[PDB]
Amino acid sequence: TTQVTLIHKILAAADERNLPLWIGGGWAIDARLGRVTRKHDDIDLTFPGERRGELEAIVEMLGGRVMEELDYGFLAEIGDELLDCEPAWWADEAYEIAEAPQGSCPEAAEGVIAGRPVRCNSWEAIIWDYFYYADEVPPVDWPTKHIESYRLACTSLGAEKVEVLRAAFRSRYA
Ligand SMILES: NC[C@H]1O[C@H](O[C@H]2[C@H](O)[C@@H](O[C@H]3O[C@H](CO)[C@@H](O)[C@H](N)[C@H]3OP(=O)(O)OC[C@H]3O[C@@H](n4cnc5c(N)ncnc54)[C@H](O)[C@@H]3O)[C@H](N)C[C@@H]2N)[C@H](N)C[C@@H]1O
Ligand SMILES: [Mn+2]
Ligand SMILES: [Mn+2]
């Protein structure tokens, strides 16, 4: 419950600032499912890129700190819990993660974590990051927890749609 408690505190502080934040990765899967499916190593977040200072402020207020600057964002820590944070940028009608499919950061809260509505990245954005993962790390070297979470996300979106998205990913990076 430590992680869930932390997620709730982070989102509460963000709500208070009218700061949208999207849960990502494994917690986004569990949020859209509305069920906790397994243990999650970190908490993945997407934030408005131009309001990064506000997220850092939340981290600090909760007793944490920025730990690392990453190629795609930053890592912060609160207690022993890691926050893996990626910016999204305003694109006329929504925030969008760089290089990701349109609709990556939906405005509506489309998931639930322990009764609490949460904004979360789209299924397409979630699966897109598995495609990257497959290029950066061969799948038969993936830890099994990611093999399984990928299959779950695919079953939720649907194999027909995943096939088309994967083809688009290949074409993009052809
Ligand atoms: N939007 C553009 C970026 O998209 C991707 O970047 C991911 C990043 O990999 C991802 O972080 C994962 O990868 C990092 C290494 O680069 C690790 O340090 C993070 N703990 C990891 O987060 P985490 O382990 O929580 O996994 C979150 C998701 O991401 C993928 N993933 C899972 N494990 C890996 C891995 N070792 N390398 C690459 N991708 C990985 C899976 O699809 C997973 O659902 C961020 N949480 C979101 C970000 N969108 C591309 N790899 C790089 C690209 O520039
Ligand atoms: Mn991981
Ligand atoms: Mn994660």
From TrEMBL:
AMP binds at G26, Y133, E136. Keywords: Metal-binding, Nucleotide-binding, Plasmid. It comes from the Bacteria. Mn(2+) 2 binds at D42, D44, D84. Transmembrane segments: none annotated. Mn(2+) 1 binds at D42, D44. GO terms for molecular function: metal ion binding; nucleotide binding. This is AadB. It comes from Pseudomonas aeruginosa.
